Amino acid sequence: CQFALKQPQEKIVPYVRQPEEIIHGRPLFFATAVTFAGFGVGLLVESHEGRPTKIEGNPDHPASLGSTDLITQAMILTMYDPDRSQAPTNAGQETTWDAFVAAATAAMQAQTAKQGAGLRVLSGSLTSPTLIAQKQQLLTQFPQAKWYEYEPVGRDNANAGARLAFGADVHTIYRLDTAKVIVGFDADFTAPSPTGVRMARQLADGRRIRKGTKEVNRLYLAESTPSITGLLADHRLPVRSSQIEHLVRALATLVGVPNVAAGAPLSDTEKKWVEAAAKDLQANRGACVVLVGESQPPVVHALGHAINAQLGNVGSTVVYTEPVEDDPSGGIAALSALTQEMNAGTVEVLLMIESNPVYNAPADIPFAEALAKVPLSMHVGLYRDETAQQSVWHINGAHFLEAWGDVRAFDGTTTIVQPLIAPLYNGKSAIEVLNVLLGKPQETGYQTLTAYWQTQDASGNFRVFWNTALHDGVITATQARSRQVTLQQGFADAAPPAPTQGLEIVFRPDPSLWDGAFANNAWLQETPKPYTKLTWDNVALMSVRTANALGLKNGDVVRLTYQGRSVDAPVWVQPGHADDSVTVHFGFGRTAAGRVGNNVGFNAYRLRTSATPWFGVGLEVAKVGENYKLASTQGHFLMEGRKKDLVRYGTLAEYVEDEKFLQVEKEEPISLIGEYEYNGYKWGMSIDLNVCNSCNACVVACQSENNIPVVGKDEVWLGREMHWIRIDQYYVGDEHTPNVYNMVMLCQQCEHAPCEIVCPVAATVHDAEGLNNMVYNRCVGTKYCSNNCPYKVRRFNFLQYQDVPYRSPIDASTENDSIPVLKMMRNPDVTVRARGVMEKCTFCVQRINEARIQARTENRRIADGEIMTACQQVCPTQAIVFGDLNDPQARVVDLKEQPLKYTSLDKLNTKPRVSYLAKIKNLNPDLAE
Amino acid sequence: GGGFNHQLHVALGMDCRYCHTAVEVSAHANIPPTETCMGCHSQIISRSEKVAFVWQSWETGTSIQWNKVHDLPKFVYFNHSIHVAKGVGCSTCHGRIDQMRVVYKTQPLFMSWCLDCHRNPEKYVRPREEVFNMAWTPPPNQLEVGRRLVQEYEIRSSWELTNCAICHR
Amino acid sequence: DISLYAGSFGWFFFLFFLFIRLLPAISIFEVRDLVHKTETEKALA
Amino acid sequence: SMYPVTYIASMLILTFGGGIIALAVLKSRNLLPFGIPVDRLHDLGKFLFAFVAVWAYVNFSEYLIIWSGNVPELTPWHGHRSAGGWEILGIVMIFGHFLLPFML
Amino acid sequence: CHLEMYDQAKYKPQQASEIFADGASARPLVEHTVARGRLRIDATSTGRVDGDPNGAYVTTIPIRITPELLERGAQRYRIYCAVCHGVNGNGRGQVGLLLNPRPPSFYDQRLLDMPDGEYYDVLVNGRRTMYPYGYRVQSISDRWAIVAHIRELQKNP
Amino acid sequence: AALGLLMYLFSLAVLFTVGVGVWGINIPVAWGFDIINFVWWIGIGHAGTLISAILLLFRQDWRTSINRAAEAMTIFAVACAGIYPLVHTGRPWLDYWMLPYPGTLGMWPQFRSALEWDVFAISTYATVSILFWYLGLIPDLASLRDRATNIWVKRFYGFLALGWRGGARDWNRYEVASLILAGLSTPLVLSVHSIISLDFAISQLPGWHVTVFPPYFVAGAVYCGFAMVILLLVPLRRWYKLHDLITIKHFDLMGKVMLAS
Ligand code: HEC
Numbered sequence A: 001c002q003f004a005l006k007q008p009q010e011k012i013v014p015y016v017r018q019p020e021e022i023i024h025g026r027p028l029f030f031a032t033a034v035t036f037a038g039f040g041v042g043l044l045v046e047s048h049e050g051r052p053t054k055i056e057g058n059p060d061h062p063a064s065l066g067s068t069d070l071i072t073q074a075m076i077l078t079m080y081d082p083d084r085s086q087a088p089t090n091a092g093q094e095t096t097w098d099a100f101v102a103a104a105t106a107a108m109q110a111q112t113a114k115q116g117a118g119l120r121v122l123s124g125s126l127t128s129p130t131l132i133a134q135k136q137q138l139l140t141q142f143p144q145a146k147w148y149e150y151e152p153v154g155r156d157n158a159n160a161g162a163r164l165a166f167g168a169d170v171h172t173i174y175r176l177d178t179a180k181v182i183v184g185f186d187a188d189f190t191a192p193s194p195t196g197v198r199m200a201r202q203l204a205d206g207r208r209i210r211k212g213t214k215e216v217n218r219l220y221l222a223e224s225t226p227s228i229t230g231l232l233a234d235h236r237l238p239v240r241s242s243q244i245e246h247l248v249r250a251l252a253t254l255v256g257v258p259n260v261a262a263g264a265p266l267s268d269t270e271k272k273w274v275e276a277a278a279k280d281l282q283a284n285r286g287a288c289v290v291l292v293g294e295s296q297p298p299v300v301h302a303l304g305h306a307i308n309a310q311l312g313n314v315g316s317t318v319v320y321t322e323p324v325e326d327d328p329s330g331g332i333a334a335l336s337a338l339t340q341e342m343n344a345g346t347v348e349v350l351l352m353i354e355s356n357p358v359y360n361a362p363a364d365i366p367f368a369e370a371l372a373k374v375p376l377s378m379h380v381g382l383y384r385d386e387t388a389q390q391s392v393w394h395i396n397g398a399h400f401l402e403a404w405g406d407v408r409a410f411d412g413t414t415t416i417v418q419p420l421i422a423p424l425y426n427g428k429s430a431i432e433v434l435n436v437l438l439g440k441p442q443e444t445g446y447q448t449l450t451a452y453w454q455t456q457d458a459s460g461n462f463r464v465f466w467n468t469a470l471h472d473g474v475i476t477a478t479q480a481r482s483r484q485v486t487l488q489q490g491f492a493d494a495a496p497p498a499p500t501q502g503l504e505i506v507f508r509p510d511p512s513l514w515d516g517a518f519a520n521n522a523w524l525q526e527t528p529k530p531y532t533k534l535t536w537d538n539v540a541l542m543s544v545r546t547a548n549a550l551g552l553k554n555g556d557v558v559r560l561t562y563q564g565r566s567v568d569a570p571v572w573v574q575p576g577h578a579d580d581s582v583t584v585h586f587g588f589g590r591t592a593a594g595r596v597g598n599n600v601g602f603n604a605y606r607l608r609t610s611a612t613p614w615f616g617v618g619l620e621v622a623k624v625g626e627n628y629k630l631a632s633t634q635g636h637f638l639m640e641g642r643k644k645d646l647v648r649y650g651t652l653a654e655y656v657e658d659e660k661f662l663q664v665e666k667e668e669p670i671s672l673i674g675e676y677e678y679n680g681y682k683w684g685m686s687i688d689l690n691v692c693n694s695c696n697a698c699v700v701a702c703q704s705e706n707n708i709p710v711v712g713k714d715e716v717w718l719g720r721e722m723h724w725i726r727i728d729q730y731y732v733g734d735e736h737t738p739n740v741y742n743m744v745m746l747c748q749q750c751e752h753a754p755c756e757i758v759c760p761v762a763a764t765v766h767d768a769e770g771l772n773n774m775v776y777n778r779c780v781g782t783k784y785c786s787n788n789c790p791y792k793v794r795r796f797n798f799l800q801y802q803d804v805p806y807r808s809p810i811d812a813s814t815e816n817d818s819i820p821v822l823k824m825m826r827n828p829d830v831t832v833r834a835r836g837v838m839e840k841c842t843f844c845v846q847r848i849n850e851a852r853i854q855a856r857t858e859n860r861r862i863a864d865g866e867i868m869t870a871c872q873q874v875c876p877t878q879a880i881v882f883g884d885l886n887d888p889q890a891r892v893v894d895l896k897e898q899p900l901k902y903t904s905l906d907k908l909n910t911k912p913r914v915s916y917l918a919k920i921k922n923l924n925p926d927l928a929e
Numbered sequence B: 001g002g003g004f005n006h007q008l009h010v011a012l013g014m015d016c017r018y019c020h021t022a023v024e025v026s027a028h029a030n031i032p033p034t035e036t037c038m039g040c041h042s043q044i045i046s047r048s049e050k051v052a053f054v055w056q057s058w059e060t061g062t063s064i065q066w067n068k069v070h071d072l073p074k075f076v077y078f079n080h081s082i083h084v085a086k087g088v089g090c091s092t093c094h095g096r097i098d099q100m101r102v103v104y105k106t107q108p109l110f111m112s113w114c115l116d117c118h119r120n121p122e123k124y125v126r127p128r129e130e131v132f133n134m135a136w137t138p139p140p141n142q143l144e145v146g147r148r149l150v151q152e153y154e155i156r157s158s159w160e161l162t163n164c165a166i167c168h169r
Numbered sequence C: 001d002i003s004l005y006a007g008s009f010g011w012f013f014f015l016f017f018l019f020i021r022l023l024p025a026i027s028i029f030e031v032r033d034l035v036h037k038t039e040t041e042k043a044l045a
Numbered sequence D: 001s002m003y004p005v006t007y008i009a010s011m012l013i014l015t016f017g018g019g020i021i022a023l024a025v026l027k028s029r030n031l032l033p034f035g036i037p038v039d040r041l042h043d044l045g046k047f048l049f050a051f052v053a054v055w056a057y058v059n060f061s062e063y064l065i066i067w068s069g070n071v072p073e074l075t076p077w078h079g080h081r082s083a084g085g086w087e088i089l090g091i092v093m094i095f096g097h098f099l100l101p102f103m104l
Numbered sequence E: 001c002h003l004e005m006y007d008q009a010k011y012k013p014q015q016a017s018e019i020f021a022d023g024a025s026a027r028p029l030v031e032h033t034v035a036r037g038r039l040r041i042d043a044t045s046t047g048r049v050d051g052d053p054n055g056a057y058v059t060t061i062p063i064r065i066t067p068e069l070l071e072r073g074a075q076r077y078r079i080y081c082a083v084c085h086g087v088n089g090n091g092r093g094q095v096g097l098l099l100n101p102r103p104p105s106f107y108d109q110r111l112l113d114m115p116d117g118e119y120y121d122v123l124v125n126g127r128r129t130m131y132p133y134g135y136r137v138q139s140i141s142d143r144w145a146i147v148a149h150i151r152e153l154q155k156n157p
Numbered sequence F: 001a002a003l004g005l006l007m008y009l010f011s012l013a014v015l016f017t018v019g020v021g022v023w024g025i026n027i028p029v030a031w032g033f034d035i036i037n038f039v040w041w042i043g044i045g046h047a048g049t050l051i052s053a054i055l056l057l058f059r060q061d062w063r064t065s066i067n068r069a070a071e072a073m074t075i076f077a078v079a080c081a082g083i084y085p086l087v088h089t090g091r092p093w094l095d096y097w098m099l100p101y102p103g104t105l106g107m108w109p110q111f112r113s114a115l116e117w118d119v120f121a122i123s124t125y126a127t128v129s130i131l132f133w134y135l136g137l138i139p140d141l142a143s144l145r146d147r148a149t150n151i152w153v154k155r156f157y158g159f160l161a162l163g164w165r166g167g168a169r170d171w172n173r174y175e176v177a178s179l180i181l182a183g184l185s186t187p188l189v190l191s192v193h194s195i196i197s198l199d200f201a202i203s204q205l206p207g208w209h210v211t212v213f214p215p216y217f218v219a220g221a222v223y224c225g226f227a228m229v230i231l232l233l234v235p236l237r238r239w240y241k242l243h244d245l246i247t248i249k250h251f252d253l254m255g256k257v258m259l260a261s
């Protein structure tokens, strides 16, 4: 409770030397990129005045055509995270940077007498050209040094299955522009994977249902765990994940591949799925693809190319190129190769750059105890991870918005990582750290970055290239060229083993938290996991069949014992899941993540094996718990007969025969309450639920943009999550194998808004532009408006929801004290709500006002693509489309005329301003029934 | 220290956009940096205790902590460059800055004053060219001349301009 | 919610026990009537 | 609901208005077996007056509810009875049914 | 009275900061970064033959001098330069008479043969005594419009 | 009762300081005990005026003994019901915004929401059932003053009973002021728990938009209210020796009006 007769004397500090580019009060977007798995995503970040505020996709980048990921969106909080490392630590004791260079260059001179024998490095699957080129200088200045690449989720099998089927290593580039039939076994390709944004848009661009569409992608998915690809999957099949490895062997025998030698008979329903898929891939041969996820063994990815090249997809859909990353022979096998070298004391200088393997170890590779058997073990990470607890040195991280580096996306399009801000704490990124090891410490990151690109630029001048490389970000001059392949057969000649019986633990990365490197990110943790709306919890998902067998509920706490190691995990029954198998999420139980992901339980990394690192059939469940919180946001996961108001579904079998087959013909509803005219801009939105794969990137995009506060798990279980936009899974019918549909629910900006007539002080009123205006300051916290809101979109700041993972909201001694590091990630044109103030999806008025005012200043009108809401230009699939409804040539008023257009709860005349499109899901004739 | 009297500085012919450059282009009318003040005071009255605070801000990297006199509550989201573009001169909100040795509030920023011109802009809207002319006294017929400038500028109605989203975004 | 509702009966009985002790817990002149009204009806009978 | 209740509050106006009507036609022609006490005629007048207030309490609250949240299933009643000339009989209910016999 | 959201945990276009050494909340741009709208490598955005800092300057103004731009130049010259170079360009501004190496008037043979590049170079980077402008103009259209008006001030000595 | 008040002022000091979210109210159900107890506590107070005011219309005499023990029961059931709409708001300090006042910013309360009619029903119900209760006391506080025989106690009631004096004309002005106030507190409490009824019936919710809420919330307030009148009079009849005034016929008739409701 703050009170004063006068607000304090707010100061106005100008610059000391204002840059020629900073106009105070204007976004000034930059062009950088983010190493997700070594591959770039090509960002375009809002740099208000030196500091970044909001991360957006660079529309010129191939890995993100203007829309970002879920992790990639919330990585503006990972930077403005008060738990980020602020100074190097020598043996736990905080120390200076120049003290590290004194003891790092002294180790190089001790690693020079010996010909660089103990200078092992544990970076994680880097594709950066300037980091590769400094890896080259480090391995020739020290010839015996080795560089082990270990990413816990990266292409360990797909890169070892590419050279298992082709000889040398290749880097496949799947293209879904021309792909009528996708059959991706365990393929979570619309996932946080490096190609996840493009493979979500190129797959959505095939299922753009319009007034006259007749051909749509099919996407047969075959996956044990329900995933964000299974939403767009039209025939998803819950498989054990031990049958996938011989479910592709069955498809590679229907399609004619010579020596597959399939085995382990499939099923009555898994076989009917593999005949209908193969009979669908033999048709439209040139326009099809057979994807394979990462969980599968390398012999399956070898068959993924044995079928793709058999259907003639090479050169058309699947394109093999030079490997973008430096060495694809690293990963689980390179981590064990180094750990066996850290044992017996061969390693003397171990620079673990960003891998964090003390946490990410498969629990068979004993990296935790192999560490400290070395004399000097460095680390350069933005968080003091579980390695920094055990390593000697720990250099600060220099998060990618503060580091002068580069990336190389898929297909090789390098993007110069562009530091928006100078590092909040002295950064010393992976390039500024190898400069210490190479012997050039005082040479900054930007100096080596151009000292490498001046060599790689032979065409024309440099400042006409370097600044053009910095402006677009995309250099697109190092495009990974194609490579002729051979597909040497006989790789599947080895017979499949005897099928093992027992419950199977399938290891999966968490959609939101990929591999635990972002566990302290409160935004992508509060964000509900896609199918199970849990927020702050890692669970053991089971199908309803394989939990009624064990007598398990949605709240018990089982003890997953897989090959001797027990984990004591919760349980959450997931209807779409597969029989006799559980899944796990990678990256939750972190002893030293920070203050956010510090004790979110169930570290699933301590159950792997490094021989069965993605799925294994030796699990014993044996429940040892009774009750757990398991804060999930949704509540009821069933369409309780309320179709026509929730996500309406159909099929293309009955859409070509009747376009308006789910648009109910209703007369003009009588409305006593007047009628207002909006002759200005009529701001409306048209969501296409056919392509909403629950990526949850729009959930974080509304958090990064609208200063939405994180809530603790203790208050999300109470149903007090602040999320102006939410995606709703609904699980229609047949709880063993249910179809799942999304209706992304936000504030419909109702013209006859019932939530407005019910505010006593008249806080929430409508607009002359046509959108419900929530006024956070006139809100006295009556909270009645939500009770009148039919959709329950309005969220209420019950307690002082602000910096909540860093200060528990149930206190009030610090509720007026704000974290100074967090005050920068907040949008400078959205109100940071106090407690007792309701909020809702305001169509991003912070973007409508700043653009209308720029239009009225210039005496012109708003262009159709000028006002993109935060959730519209972040959705990879481009489901959300926002724009003027009065502008007749707009992509919304030409999108609200589709035969699938409907509004939620039209039985009560709210005149919702968002109008969802139905989910037409292209069922096969000979596979449905 | 020194205080920066506007009356002495504008009297040198400074057209009010020398400093405050971000007006008429951005939402926030900027305060000039140390380089602007040191643009002249590097040799105008350097080595004087009245101006030794921009030198203390120029040698040291610290920026000047100007006390804000027009202090809106940060949930209101004022926007210059649309009042300056729709013919609302620098007076009538800031008062005669040319006669201000120390800047003080003249209009108390009530929201009964912001809505008073949003509900009725014709009482204060002036020509676009005479916006940075602080000697502008409204004519005896301010209405039916400001009424005529409303259609000339297409300034929106009292229904579109006072609806909780203009301010309070 | 419990410590406010069950405490609301405190604010009810804090005032209701003050009213009993300070003020007449039952009307006096209205009970002076219905006594004058009972004798007025007993007068005829 | 309260559609059968807005009749009940109007069943009590007719039987009380008719009670004063029938007691007057019987007293104007001198047919009553008892002279109407002027204080108990004031009781029938207080009942008649209190039930024009209850009738206006049940008809308006039936409208104030359906008008406020205009769910198009409850709306067609007051929607058809407020347009096309039925609003003339609607504004009579507000003024000639309540406000005129409430002030009188 | 209640200051609930009067001061919010976010950095508006200008207000003090409690994290950085010079409390600014407006951090300096990193030295060699290029924004999305600010490329500045051609003869237009910088007055050099191909954008090279070791270039040869531009003799004619690159942008097309439309008649509505000279009134934008004469209005922008009257704002920035006229306070210290004089309204008519003869270096007799009210502040110019008080600078010790007094601003050089135009209409002298040294500044007529001086190319539009220098007139733009000092308008963006300043001189040995004139502090750098271009963070005040901040727009290439008005940056060359000022040079256009000074190009037409010299049309009547 | 005072230790119950220290729990009241501490559950309020914890609510004002920590927040309105220490109540377990979710986002679907944002209205929990704070409004269940508001409608309940104000519902209790409605059958204290049906005894004191609505029965004065019917000139009935089983209301005289139970008059003040129910009329004073209303006020203290409004003093505990008039706090929840002032405290269930997330920002209680800005509860003056629900009042119409020229306030240097052109905002006024809405006057389309029943939380804005509540602050006009609760505030009227308070300052009318207080005045009609203080009206019913000036003759009694004149009886307490004349029978006190204790200076500074006779002065206390002599100050509350302003100058009552009895009076032939002062009693006629009282009989018309008490009849009209009874004739005004009959449509008041028929509307106060009808306006409180309308903060559910103006919402489009399925269980809330039931149109018969006004003549059923009022019927519920008279129902729960007489229960509280009986709960507070069986002890006042037994412990306080008022067997000669609150006779069993009062409970026989209160049990019937509690049944007719
Ligand atoms: C050139 C256009 C100037 C700019 C830019 C700034 N100032 Fe200035 N200032 C200028 C002159 C010609 C004078 C008077 C010269 C003299 O001999 O007095 C001043 C004076 C001041 C003063 C002192 C006022 C007084 O009455 O003595 C102060 C405190 C001052 N100036 C402050 C100041 C600041 C803060 C500036 C940056 C916004 C600034 N000046 C710029 C000329 C110019």
Ligand code: HEC
Binding pocket: A012, B003, B004, B006, B009, B010, B014, B015, B016, B017, B018, B019, B020, B031, B032, B066, B067, B068, B069, B070, B071, B090, B091, B094, B097, B098, B102, B103, B134
């Ligand atoms: C540089 C010499 C300036 C000129 C020319 C103008 N202004 Fe200014 N202004 C300047 C500074 C350094 C400051 C902050 C110092 C202070 O005393 O506040 C200001 C401030 C204002 C303000 C108030 C800002 C606030 O803190 O709320 C106003 C309203 C203002 N200035 C108006 C204004 C006008 C109308 C001008 C043209 C005559 C003008 N300024 C010119 C620097 C300079």
Ligand code: HEC
Binding pocket: A012, B016, B020, B023, B028, B029, B030, B031, B068, B070, B071, B072, B073, B074, B078, B080, B083, B084, B088, B089, B090, B091, B092, B093, B094, B109, B131, B132, E014
């Ligand atoms: C009424 C519509 C105004 C007009 C016309 C001008 N100004 Fe303004 N000014 C106004 C307000 C309500 C505020 C405070 C709002 C806030 O959040 O800051 C200001 C403030 C300034 C400032 C300081 C801004 C800051 O430091 O944050 C300056 C420098 C300023 N104003 C300058 C200025 C000039 C030069 C104007 C004429 C073109 C002018 N203002 C007009 C309200 C209004």
Ligand code: HEC
Binding pocket: A849, A852, A853, A856, B076, B077, B078, B079, B082, B083, B086, B088, B092, B093, B109, B111, B113, B114, B115, B116, B117, B118, B121, B124, B125, B154, B155, B156, B161, B165, B166, B167
């Ligand atoms: C009369 C002198 C005014 C005062 C006092 C305030 N404003 Fe204003 N404003 C005025 C005009 C003539 C206009 C142009 C409207 C148009 O559509 O052209 C404006 C505009 C704004 C805007 C932006 C309009 C939009 O389309 O979003 C904003 C955000 C705004 N004004 C804010 C604002 C505030 C906060 C004020 C009180 C401190 C205020 N204005 C006062 C005229 C006048």
Ligand code: HEC
Binding pocket: A762, A763, A765, A775, A777, A778, A779, B072, B073, B076, B109, B110, B111, B114, B115, B118, B161, B162, B163, B164, B165, B166, B167, B168, E001, E003, E004, E005, F105, F107
């Ligand atoms: C620009 C003309 C505005 C419009 C349109 C609206 N508001 Fe406003 N508001 C504006 C200003 C300049 C201020 C500051 C007043 C002050 O005392 O400094 C305000 C303030 C408020 C407040 C007070 C908030 C507080 O914490 O005390 C409220 C409650 C408020 N405004 C409400 C409100 C509503 C509901 C509006 C749309 C119907 C609205 N305002 C429009 C400027 C402007």
Ligand code: HEC
Binding pocket: B039, B040, E077, E080, E081, E082, E083, E084, E085, E095, E096, E099, E101, E102, E103, E104, E118, E119, E122, E123, E127, E128, E129, E130, E131, E133, E146, E147
């Ligand atoms: C007072 C602060 C000035 C302002 C405003 C402008 N100029 Fe300037 N200028 C000033 C000085 C003190 C000098 C002398 C430079 C030196 O050698 O000491 C100058 C010089 C120039 C020149 C000539 C440079 C040369 O080497 O011959 C040019 C072409 C020039 N100035 C241009 C210019 C423009 C375009 C301005 C408006 C943005 C401007 N000046 C303003 C002082 C001041």
Ligand SMILES: CCCCCCCCCCCCCCCCCC(=O)OC[C@H](C)OC(=O)CCCCCCCCCCCCCCCCC
Binding pocket: A003, A005, E001, E002, F093, F096, F099, F123
């Ligand atoms: C239970 C209550 C509701 C009853 C039912 C409804 C009937 C309501 C009848 C009208 C009463 C409404 C009261 C609303 C008061 C709002 C004033 C306020 O809150 O100011 C806020 C601010 C913190 O304060 C300020 O900005 C200034 C603070 C100082 C002045 C405070 C004035 C308060 C009034 C008391 C007067 C005391 C004398 C003051 C003397 C000078 C003090 C400095």
Ligand code: SF4
Binding pocket: A691, A692, A693, A694, A695, A696, A697, A698, A699, A727, A744, A871, A874, A875, A876, A877, A878, A879, A880
């Ligand atoms: S609408 Fe939301 S859930 Fe759907 S694709 Fe876009 S961001 Fe993802």
Ligand code: SF4
Binding pocket: A746, A747, A748, A749, A750, A753, A754, A755, A756, A772, A788, A789, A790, A791, A792, A793, A794, A840, A910
């Ligand atoms: S959809 Fe909900 S939040 Fe949006 S205007 Fe309607 S009632 Fe309000």
Ligand code: SF4
Binding pocket: A698, A701, A702, A703, A705, A706, A724, A725, A746, A747, A840, A841, A842, A843, A844, A869, A870, A871, A872
């Ligand atoms: S429009 Fe913006 S604020 Fe509204 S729901 Fe979408 S992302 Fe969130």
Ligand code: F3S
Binding pocket: A758, A759, A760, A761, A762, A763, A764, A778, A779, A780, A781, A782, A783, A784, A785, A786, A837, A838
């Ligand atoms: S109804 Fe009214 S005042 Fe606040 S939270 Fe809900 S708006």
